[PDB]
């Protein structure tokens, strides 16, 4: 499936000026648009070549939507202080993430519309797009207000309406990069440790999309508890990389094989030292 998501952050700067407000847009893991309140001339911007072809009206309206959102966030930052009985001298953060995950037939798989205050969950729209989950007492106030104003109905219209429709358009205009598939180039390194064993690390490089399975196997079995990994890491060029390692006994390396699966790999690779 694919996804269209918007990540928003507003950081209050008491003692400096207005809250730093920001919006970032992604279709899967590629950022394609951005809005920064601090920029000299705050207006939505392209972060991927394939969105640049959108007309000035697309850009003007998105810039207008982002500013309305900035105001809303400035206001909520003040309300919070009140809800949590906090001082107006400290800096606080308010995050918002909204988006939709959709299958090939364009059917909404999962919708999101959630907030966090100072890094902790505040309130989130439930999977049913009908009810809200409030993390605490302050959030209840908000939940009851939104329950009364029928907020979930309007927000659901976006996730099921515009989110989905614009997602297919983007995937289309940007298929060349967004739907591309780069196989992973792999290899394994060797390191004799001081505990008198060896660490074997399997690298998978320059692949895309992100999804990948890097695994170590011994006697055709997955060493699920012995592996040390690192979450898939990004690169400026849009590709990803990763490694999985395991510690093995001296002179027994040839018993271990690295197994890597990927969209760009007709069949799983199997490497050795």
């Amino acid at each position: 499936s694919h996804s269209l998501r918007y990540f928003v952050t507003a950081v209050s700067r008491p003692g400096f000026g207005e809250p730093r407000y920001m919006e970032v847009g992604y279709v899967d893991n590629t950022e394609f648009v951005r809005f920064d309140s601090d920029a000299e001339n705050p207006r939505y911007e392209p972060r991927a070549r394939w969105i640049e072809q959108e007309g000035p009206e697309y850009w003007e309206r998105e810039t207008r939507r982002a500013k309305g959102n900035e105001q809303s966030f400035r206001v909520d930052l003040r309300t919070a202080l009140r809800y949590y009985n906090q001082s107006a001298g400290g800096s606080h953060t308010l995050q918002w993430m909204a988006g939709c995950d959709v299958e090939s037939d364009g059917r909404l798989l999962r919708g999101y519309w959630q907030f966090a205050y100072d890094g902790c969950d505040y309130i989130a729209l439930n999977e049913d797009l009908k009810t809200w989950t409030a993390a605490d007492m302050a959030a209840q106030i908000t939940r009851r207000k939104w329950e009364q104003a029928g907020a979930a109905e309007r927000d659901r219209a976006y996730l099921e309406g515009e989110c989905v429709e614009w997602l297919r358009r983007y995937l289309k205009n940007g298929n060349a990069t967004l739907l591309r598939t780069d196989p992973p180039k792999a290899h394994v390194t060797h390191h004799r440790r001081p505990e008198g064993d060896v660490t074997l690390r399997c690298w998978a490089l320059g692949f895309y999309p992100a999804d990948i399975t890097l695994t170590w196997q011994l006697n055709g079995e997955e060493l699920t508890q012995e592996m040390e990994l690192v979450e898939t890491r990004p690169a400026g060029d849009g590709t990803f990389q990763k490694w999985a390692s395991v510690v093995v006994p001296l002179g027994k390396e040839q018993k271990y094989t690295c197994h890597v699966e990927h969209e760009g790999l007709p069949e799983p690779l199997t490497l050795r030292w």
Partner: peptide, 9 residues
């Protein structure tokens, strides 16, 4: 396009 805030906290 992105989401719009239509309700205050």
């Amino acid at each position: 396009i992105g989401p719009g805030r239509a309700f205050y906290a």
